[PDB]
């Protein structure tokens, strides 16, 4: 039976959405069914920053960051301990935590 209303995704009015490829499995998946996250992370870590500041000329420089939009497939997403699963009722919670 029908498990969801959007049926997996956010396609209402198109027919076609020009898919993408997963980063882990290289599987071809629509852009809307997919599961976009954004890994905006400081470059090195919260740890070695002290050594870097100590050893760096150009004090207070920036400690810049790394930005990338990651599309996972459903399979790899679950396997990676992400959106894992929810009960029949809290499926409908659309918001993040």
């Amino acid at each position: 039976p029908k498990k969801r209303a959007s049926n997996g995704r956010n396609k209402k009015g198109r027919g076609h959405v020009k898919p993408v490829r997963c980063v882990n499995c290289s599987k071809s998946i629509p852009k809307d069914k997919a599961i976009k996250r954004m890994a905006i992370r400081n470059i090195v870590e919260a740890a070695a920053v002290r050594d870097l500041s100590e050893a760096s000329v150009y004090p207070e420089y920036a400690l810049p960051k790394t930005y990338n939009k990651l599309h996972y497939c459903v399979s790899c997403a679950i396997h990676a301990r992400i959106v894992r699963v929810r009960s029949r009722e809290d499926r409908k919670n659309r918001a993040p935590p």
């Binding site: 150009y58 920036a62 810049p64 930005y67 990338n68």
Partner: protein
């Protein structure tokens, strides 16, 4: 990995750094600083004339390193070598560029991006492809969450920007244009010309590149380095 190699060679010591010498790199006069660093080459043997291998060398460096301020932090610059005179070799401008971190940080969703590009030439017969970028902004007093455009505003903006850059280039040779870039006055021209259409934050321009150089003309280059 260490002992994996079955064979070093299909069919079947000397240090190279004693063979080398250091060279001081000088930037033009459109910069508060000139001494950018150093470089390495081998000795000018009888058949090499190391200047030739050193001539087309390009170096990428930070505008903040060149101007002192960290306001010009991203703004990478590419400098081509064009002339040598006794270990203090000169350079000339070859191109600008942003940093990917800055670009990606500017890029956010629920705002519309705009990009323009022109292929204009100079008064000194240089040929540049200049790239411009802009982003919508959410006015204060605004409640609705995304602040997009209507795709005609965008075309008008692109037309405006293109004609602006063509104007501000024609009249500027190369270093005139460099001194126009550095203080980011073009950005102010853009915002003044476009505020009547749409808000447009983050009007930093983008990388710029050369396509065609004119003839060498030693004098124009030496005009910069005193």
């Amino acid at each position: 990995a260490v002992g994996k190699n079955k064979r070093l060679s299909k069919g079947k010591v000397v240090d190279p750094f004693t063979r080398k010498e250091w060279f001081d790199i000088k930037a033009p006069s459109t910069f508060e600083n000139r001494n950018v660093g150093k470089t390495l080459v081998n000795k000018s043997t009888g058949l090499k004339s190391a200047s030739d291998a050193l001539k087309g060398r390009v170096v990428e460096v930070c505008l903040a390193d060149l101007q002192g301020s960290e306001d010009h932090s991203f703004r990478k610059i590419k400098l081509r070598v064009d002339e040598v005179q006794g270990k203090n070799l000169l350079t000339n401008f070859h191109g600008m560029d942003f940093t990917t971190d800055k670009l990606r940080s500017m890029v956010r969703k629920w705002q519309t991006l705009i990009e323009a590009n022109v292929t204009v030439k100079t008064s000194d017969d240089y040929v540049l492809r200049i790239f411009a970028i802009a982003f919508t902004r959410k006015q204060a007093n605004q409640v609705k969450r995304h602040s997009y455009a209507q795709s005609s505003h965008i075309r008008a903006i692109r037309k405006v920007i293109s004609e602006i850059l063509t104007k501000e280039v024609q009249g500027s040779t190369l270093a005139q244009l460099t001194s126009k870039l550095i203080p980011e006055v073009i950005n102010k021209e853009i915002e003044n010309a476009t505020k009547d259409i749409f808000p447009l934050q983050n009007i930093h321009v983008r990388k710029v590149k050369l396509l065609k150089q004119p003839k060498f003309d030693v004098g124009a280059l030496m005009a910069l380095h005193g």
